[PDB]
């Protein structure tokens with residue numbers, strides 16, 4: 001590690017602790033910058049040489065983390081817990097936390113290579129027919145979204161899970177052992193405990209569970225209604241009205257979002273067609289337009305536009321030249337207060353439009369807190385970061401806002417239209433809740449040793465059935481590693497943030513709508529052009545992680561805790577409607593025939 005990047009001396013009291021933190025953050029900017037740059041170079045251009053460079057960049061970060069970490073522990077370890085300044089307690093608490101830098105050299109390199117190999121496998125995995133091969137993004141995504149052929153959907157589902165999952169398992173086991181080894185030397189019982197500590201709530205898991213209890217009836221009812229619709233199209237052989245839904249029929253590879261089957265479930269088809277995708281295509285929208293339209297919403301709020309460095313540096317389309325990339329969307333902070341980028345293999349679609357806003361939400365956060373000390377450049381909690389863009393997308397997707405941007409010709413205000421809109425939103429937002437909740441439950445069990453390699457898939461599918469009410473359409477066994485077929489698992493990034501942001505985003509929406517002086521039903525609010533809503537959001541963004549999230553929430557929303565009530569109020573009309581539909585249809589809520597799996601199609605597997 002470069003002499004300039006190494007730590008000096010500071011006194012072993014609270015006041016020396018203050019000066020230590022000041023120089024730490026000064027050197028960290030350059031280390032973070034070269035780390036992110038090396039990751040950028042790789043994720044936008046997956047080569048062995050670029051993986052190597054990224055790995056050597058991670059080693060440097062680990063040396064850095066070691067030097068300042070050992071120093072922070074040398075001076076402050078026994079005393080920093082009783083320190084009077086709680087913000088200093090945070091930063092020093094984070095510097096005494098070495099992570100992977102706790103590993104000896106050989107194991108650091110082992111760790112770094114594993115992250116690189118898992119990433120490459122997920123992002124370059126393909127499903128071959130017999131010479132031509134389909135990628136996840138766009139090919140398999142498109143199939144799952146628009147094919148209504150059972151065997152074609154199954155081919156894509158099975159192919160993807162087999163191709164991504166199977167080779168990942170050995171590497172995932174080794175990663176887990178080394179991640180746990182690293183973080184246990186930091187005093188955590190396992191890596192899952194570390195991840196959970198970011199929410200600093202001794203009661204985190206109980207709070208989440210109480211939240212899910214309130215939300216579960218909404219899911220059960222959406223599930224039953226949707227399953228009925230699928231039965232009408234796939235028949236009695238492939239759909240069990242008292243069983244779980246096959247996992248490949250819900251419009252999405254992970255059955256995590258159901259918006260793509262909206263056309264099958266829409267209650268009042270005579271009302272404006274709220275799936276704007278075809279209108280976008282008919283009008284000739286491109287990635288560029290999508291990002292510009294999203295930017296303009298942000299500026300209508302008197303938030304920052306994207307800087308020139310964003311437009312010149314970002315990757316907004318999947319490259320056409322022989323180049324493999326990580327296609328999964330991400331927002332990037334280079335930690336030089338100048339470069340900020342999005343990397344997204346953008347598709348011309350309504351859900352991709354929401355994704356664009358979601359990604360730009362991350363960037364906007366980066367722009368607003370760029371002048372904070374480096375350690376305070378995070379969300380109030382990770383869920384805050386995830387909720388920013390979705391909140392704007394809640395406004396954008398209202399029929400009225402879509403009309404304003406030329407994506408919907410007619411404007412209607414009636415109970416039929418509302419039911420249509422709220423159902424579409426439920427398929428996006430309510431359908432996700434079980435999945436957003438279950439992913440880290442699985443992964444927390446893995447980290448704790450409750451779920452050993454011998455039960456990876458067994459436990460995955462237990463949770464998938466328990467929460468989502470779905471079943472794999474083909475038989476799985478422990479050779480399969482179906483969790484590794486989801487991006488966030490091999491890319492070693494946490495998931496509970498998304499369950500938190502799905503609750504949080506309706507809390508934010510309510511507050512910004514009230515702040516904008518909007519008096520109507522919550523699901524018809526559009527905060528577009530509300531500078532008052534903008535100023536209120538800006539305060540949250542400019543705060544970064546400088547204050548406990550409970551206080552930031554309180555200032556914004558009026559409550560210091562997560563709360564499902566604004567989500568419930570938002571969906572009240574369709575919740576009551578779906579209940580009534582199901583009772584009139586004499587549906588069974590849930591999947592009592594838990595053991596049920598669909599048969600194979602007659603000509604499986606040949607297409």
Ligand SMILES: O=C(N[C@@H](Cc1ccccc1)P(=O)(O)C[C@H](Cc1cc(-c2ccccc2)no1)C(=O)N[C@@H](Cc1ccc(O)cc1)C(=O)O)OCc1ccccc1
Nearest residue numbers: 257329330331351354355358359362379382385390493498
């Ligand atoms: O860029 C990311 N994170 C990206 C993932 C990533 C993490 C680490 C390394 C590399 C990449 P994403 O979550 O923007 C990338 C995207 C977001 C998304 C999807 C969608 C969407 C909407 C409708 C239909 C389908 C998808 N909308 O937004 C993501 O991973 N989403 C999750 C969960 C999700 C789903 C729906 C949704 O509305 C929001 C979130 C998923 O795809 O499974 O991190 C920024 C950041 C910085 C500091 C602190 C916290 C977060």
Ligand SMILES: *[C@@H]1O[C@H](CO[C@@H]2O[C@@H](C)[C@@H](O)[C@@H](O)[C@@H]2O)[C@@H](O[C@@H]2O[C@H](CO)[C@@H](O[C@@H]3O[C@H](CO)[C@@H](O)[C@H](O)[C@@H]3O)[C@H](O)[C@H]2NC(C)=O)[C@H](O)[C@H]1NC(C)=O
Nearest residue numbers: 398399400411412413414518519520521522523524525526
């Ligand atoms: C779509 O329509 C709804 C419903 O509109 C109401 O009911 C209809 C059947 C008709 O009788 C309408 O004339 C009637 O307004 C609209 O929701 C309503 O918005 C109005 C105006 O913003 C609200 O009135 C306000 O109510 C507050 C108290 O909460 C007062 O302080 C204000 O002075 C003002 O009177 C009304 O509460 C609200 N009604 C309901 C049931 O939610 C909605 O605005 C409209 N949406 C769009 C996009 O046009």
Ligand SMILES: *[C@@H]1O[C@H](CO)[C@@H](O[C@@H]2O[C@H](CO)[C@@H](O)[C@H](O)[C@H]2NC(C)=O)[C@H](O)[C@H]1NC(C)=O
Nearest residue numbers: 041044045046047048049050051319321322323
């Ligand atoms: C993708 O990464 C590779 C490195 O793996 C880049 O190839 C280098 O490009 C420079 C300048 O063109 C050459 O001087 C080097 O000799 C190349 N290195 C190797 C190992 O071939 C390549 O430029 C990147 N592609 C894109 C589009 O950015």
Ligand SMILES: *[C@@H]1O[C@H](CO[C@@H]2O[C@@H](C)[C@@H](O)[C@@H](O)[C@@H]2O)[C@@H](O)[C@H](O)[C@H]1NC(C)=O
Nearest residue numbers: 158162474475476477478479480600604605
């Ligand atoms: C796990 O399963 C592997 C493949 O699955 C099997 O073949 C497919 C095409 C389906 O027909 C399915 O019913 C079968 O389970 C097997 O090749 C492998 O041997 C199994 N692993 C173990 C340890 O038994």
Ligand SMILES: [Cl-]
Nearest residue numbers: 382494496497
């Ligand atoms: Cl998280």
Ligand SMILES: [Zn+2]
Nearest residue numbers: 358362385386
């Ligand atoms: Zn995100």
